[PDB]
Swiss-Prot record, chain B:
Protein name: Ephrin type-A receptor 4
Domain of life: Eukaryota
Part of the whole protein covered: 29 to 204 of 986
Domain remarks in the Swiss-Prot or TrEMBL record: The protein kinase domain mediates interaction with NGEF.
Tissue and organ distribution: Ubiquitous.
Gene responsible for this protein: EPHA4
Quaternary state and interactors: Heterotetramer upon binding of the ligand. The heterotetramer is composed of an ephrin dimer and a receptor dimer. Oligomerization is probably required to induce biological responses. Interacts with CDK5, CDK5R1 and NGEF; upon activation by EFNA1 induces NGEF phosphorylation by the kinase CDK5. Interacts with CHN1; effector of EPHA4 in axon guidance linking EPHA4 activation to RAC1 regulation.
Compartment(s): Cell membrane; Cell projection, Axon; Cell projection, Dendrite; Postsynaptic density membrane
Role summary: Receptor tyrosine kinase which binds membrane-bound ephrin family ligands residing on adjacent cells, leading to contact-dependent bidirectional signaling into neighboring cells. The signaling pathway downstream of the receptor is referred to as forward signaling while the signaling pathway downstream of the ephrin ligand is referred to as reverse signaling. Highly promiscuous, it has the unique property among Eph receptors to bind and to be physiologically activated by both GPI-anchored ephrin-A and transmembrane ephrin-B ligands including EFNA1 and EFNB3.
Residues in Eph LBD domain copies: 5-179
Organism: Homo sapiens
Family to which this protein belongs: Belongs to the protein kinase superfamily. Tyr protein kinase family. Ephrin receptor subfamily.
Length: 12, 179
């Protein structure tokens, strides 16, 4: 992965 | 309050990269900076190998002195993505992570075995949250606290184990209460 990363919000 | 607490570790107040030890070194837990309003990095650790089986990703702090405290308190702010919010078939997706410690007089341990770590708890998103205003956004994060003790070596290491979740550890603070 990472399938998603957390930035403020998750983005996948 | 802070007046009666003595901080032993606060990931938010470290200057530069945390450089904590990840096993595996690549492709598991990784450092990700989130920039606050003053362009100071919030040093997070993240892993999200939800598409791959048999995850066993470890992350450990550097050595933390206990300064004569026998009971310490570990406060973690984090966020997870729920498995049901991640498209794809993910038979082994998880929504928890495991927290451990290892006591040692040696402040420069390397390759501590998995079986030397003592489990504190399985950590999940539960009822408790905090809001961290970083300018453009307000981070809504789960907040969990656990006590550990009694401790009796000069210090200890904390570790986080991922077994297949989509997790961001945003803040880790460890403190004791001073009589």
């Amino acid at each position: 992965x990472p399938y998603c990363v957390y930035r403020x919000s998750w983005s996948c | 309050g802070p007046g009666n607490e003595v901080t032993l570790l606060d990931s938010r107040s470290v200057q530069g990269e945390l450089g904590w030890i990840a096993s595996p070194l690549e492709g598991g837990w990784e450092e990700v900076s989130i920039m606050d309003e003053k362009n100071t990095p919030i040093r997070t650790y993240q892993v999200c190998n939800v598409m791959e089986p048999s995850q066993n990703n470890w992350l450990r702090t550097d050595w933390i002195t206990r300064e004569g405290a026998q009971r310490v308190y570990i406060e973690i702010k984090f966020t997870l993505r729920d498995c049901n919010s991640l498209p794809g078939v993910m038979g082994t997706c998880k929504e928890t992570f495991n927290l451990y410690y290892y006591e040692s007089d040696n402040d420069k341990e390397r390759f501590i075995r998995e079986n030397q770590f003592v489990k504190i708890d399985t950590i999940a998103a539960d009822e408790s949250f905090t809001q961290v205003d970083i300018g453009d956004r307000i981070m809504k994060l789960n907040t969990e606290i656990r006590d550990v003790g009694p401790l009796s070596k000069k210090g200890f290491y904390l570790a986080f184990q991922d077994v297949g979740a989509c997790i961001a550890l945003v803040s880790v603070r460890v403190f004791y209460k001073k009589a």
